[PDB]
């Protein structure tokens, strides 16, 4: 996911004295990419296993200014106004309570600090919203919900973040590879195939659904965005 990462780095306007928090840090790629440009990166991930993976990956690359810990966005342990930049890349759809996550992000962000949020999102039309959320939940039972852009705008406003859409793009998904990386079993996959094959015309257009004549899916697109939040006042 080099495009989203490069976009975030570009948009962040990194300075050498900046402190960065990465929410849902995974194997540590986002934090490592920021590390040459800032003073310090802190990653939080929900699983102990990813915290250990990220830390050994930092060691293996010799970076000394990145640290990882276990935690969730819904309860960040950090003081108010402590980060210059907060990043969240393809993680929000896994939050158990996104409204509480944003409240926490806003709390720990410094005044005029930047929240850089990349995720795929639900179209405004509730039927397309539902189609894509169901598709992603079938493949990943960790999936909670991908919010609409309306919803993000309302959550930012609720927490005194200025909202800006930096870039929107279609995120192309190669079906065979997507199923393999999800480890989805045959019966779960059969449900995915039925879902894609029975898509409305509007869903087929919106999500760029490509199929074989025998109904075996080939590709589709998710709707991706980089949103920037800036902490202001109320």
Curated annotation (Swiss-Prot):
S-adenosyl-L-methionine binds at residues 24, 45-46, 73-74, 89. GO terms for biological process: methylation. InterPro entries: Diverse_substrate_MTase, Methyltransf_11, SAM-dependent_MTases_sf. One of its GO terms (molecular function) is S-adenosylmethionine-dependent methyltransferase activity. CDD domains: AdoMet_MTases. Its EC number is 2.1.1.-. Keywords: Methyltransferase, S-adenosyl-L-methionine, Transferase. It is an enzyme of class 2 (transferase). Belongs to the methyltransferase superfamily. This is Uncharacterized methyltransferase YcgJ.
């Amino acid at each position: 996911h080099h495009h989203s990462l490069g976009l975030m780095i570009k948009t962040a306007e990194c300075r050498a004295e900046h402190r960065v928090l990465d929410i849902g840090a995974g194997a540590g790629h986002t934090a490592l990419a920021f590390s040459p440009y800032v003073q310090e990166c802190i990653g939080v991930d929900a699983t102990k296993e990813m915290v250990e993976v990220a830390s050994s990956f930092a060691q293996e690359k010799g970076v000394e200014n990145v640290r990882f810990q276990q935690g969730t966005a819904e309860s960040l342990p950090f003081p108010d106004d402590s980060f210059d930049i907060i990043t969240c890349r393809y993680a929000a759809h896994h939050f158990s309570d996104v409204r509480k996550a944003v409240r926490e992000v806003a709390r720990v962000l410094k005044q005029d600090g930047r929240f850089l949020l990349v995720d795929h999102y639900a179209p405004e039309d509730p039927v397309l919203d539902e189609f894509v959320n169901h598709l992603n939940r079938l493949r990943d039972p960790s999936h909670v919900r991908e919010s609409s852009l309306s919803e993000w705008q309302a959550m930012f406003s609720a927490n005194q973040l200025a909202y800006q859409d930096i870039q929107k793009w279609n995120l192309p998904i190669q079906y065979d590879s997507w199923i393999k990386r999800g480890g989805t079993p045959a019966d779960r996959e059969k449900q995915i195939i039925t879902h894609l094959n029975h898509a409305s015309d509007e869903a087929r257009d919106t999500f760029c659904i490509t199929l074989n004549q025998n109904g075996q899916p080939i590709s589709f697109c998710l709707k991706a965005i980089l949103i920037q939040g800036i902490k202001r006042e109320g």
